[PDB]
């Protein structure tokens, strides 16, 4: 189907430790495949998915250098940001960056992304035409003027239309085994009595990838929009995901309740009931 | 901006007493990124606890998975303790194998 | 592959 590559940078300034902590993680869809942490003993890009290990020493050395320069640049961006908001140096502040590209089933660029947050609020973002920015702020308007004079957008476009898509296609092919895969949820319902006349039915989805999933409970085919307890989808720690939904039902009438699981790996939604 | 962490404590596989498993503490929705997470076995912190690489969601809030190998039992109680600038005191959430 | 092009671009 459709696919995405994304990198997430976080930079956190520290008051007396002169350099910010800089962390980067790289993803294809919901699979983490690289990481970099400036606080490591010897900071360098490290593999985090099997299919990226075959990349050569020039891949790791070049990316390590990119992160090292990005950490220093972030350090200076953080100062500039503190200056723009008249904040004192003694404060700890956060700069996050998120960028990458989306491709369709044929591998053509669908969309490029490149945006920033400062202390958790949108700061500046590259627009969909990859030729202009939306500034969220008076401070971000300073960044915009500078990036307009530098023709920054044209540099982001060079990457997003070029090497971004090109390496994503290469990864999708190298990890085809696990990336074109959609693993459908293996599902079951459990029964937990509350009292003599109440019981909880819990609908479980386990071992599925990617994370997107919808669980919906129905009594007699009617959606239980309210009355359904839903946990946030959560990582199992093995690159698959977990989720459950629950309803409290009257004892005796449990077969009237049905759980529907919809997922990308399910051509037909699963319908589940106890037992 | 400041956001409080959401916390879930759970196992990778369905709990079976005597079977080795992984105990997970999933912290999410929080900002800023500094966060303290311990896993507890009968109230004492477990030594060998790994965590995932810091990432964040679409609303910019961070998430992390803390996890350790463990073997659950009838009697042994497991929990997750989290502190964050948005929390007055540490928050402890006990592990329920049915959740 | 990270974007090396922008690794010098300050905000």
Numbering used by the authors:
A (entry chain F): 1 to 275
B (entry chain A): 1 to 99
C (entry chain Q): 1 to 11
From the publication, what sentences describe this entry?
CD8+ T-cells provide broadly cross-reactive immunity and alleviate disease severity by recognizing conserved epitopes. Here we identify 9 highly conserved IBV CD8+ T-cell epitopes restricted to HLA-B*07:02, HLA-B*08:01 and HLA-B*35:01. HLA-restriction was further validated using peptide pHLA-I tetramer staining for 7 IBV epitopes that elicited the strongest IFN-γ+TNF+ CD8+ T cell responses and displayed >99% conservation among IBVs circulating in the human population between 1940 and 2023. This included 2 HLA-B*07:02 (B7/NP30, B7/NS1196), 3 HLA-B*08:01 (B8/NP30, B8/NP92, B8/NP479) and 2 HLA-B*35:01 (B35/HA231, B35/NS1260) tetramers.
Although representing approximately 11% of HLA-B*07:02 ligands, 11mer peptides such as, the NS1196-206 peptide are considered long with regards to the structural constraints of the HLA-I binding cleft. To establish whether the NS1196-206 peptide also bulges out of the HLA-B*07:02 peptide binding cleft, we crystallized and solved the structure of HLA-B*07:02-NS1196-206 at a resolution of 2.4 Å. Structural analysis showed that the peptide NS1196-206 interacts with hydrogen bonds to side chain residues of HLA α1 and α2 helices. Considering the anchor residues at the extremities of the peptide (P2 and PΩ), the 11-mer peptide bulged out from central P4-Gly to P8-Leu to adopt stable conformation and providing a surface for TCR recognition. In terms of HLA-I and peptide specificity, polymorphic residues Asp-114, and Glu-152 form hydrogen bonds with the side chain of P6-Lys and P9-Ser, respectively. Accordingly, the NS1196-206 epitope forms a stable conformation that bulges out of the HLA-B*07:02 cleft, which is in accordance with the relatively robust B7/NS1196-specific CD8+ T cell frequencies. At 11 amino acids long, the NS1196-206 peptide has a length that surpasses the typical 8-10 amino acid length of HLA-I ligands, leading to a bulging confirmation when presented on HLA-B*07:02 consistent with other long (≥11 amino acids) HLA-I ligands. Stable bulging peptides are usually associated with highly restricted/clonal TCR repertoires, whereas structural flexibility of bulging peptides more often results in diverse TCR repertoires. In the case of B7/NS1196-206, we observed a diverse TCR repertoire, which may be reflective of the low mobility of the bulged section. B7/NS1196+CD8+ TCRαβ repertoire was dominated by TRBV27-TRAV38-2/DV8 expressing clonotypes paired with a variety of TRAJ and TRBJ gene segments and was detected in 3/6 donors.
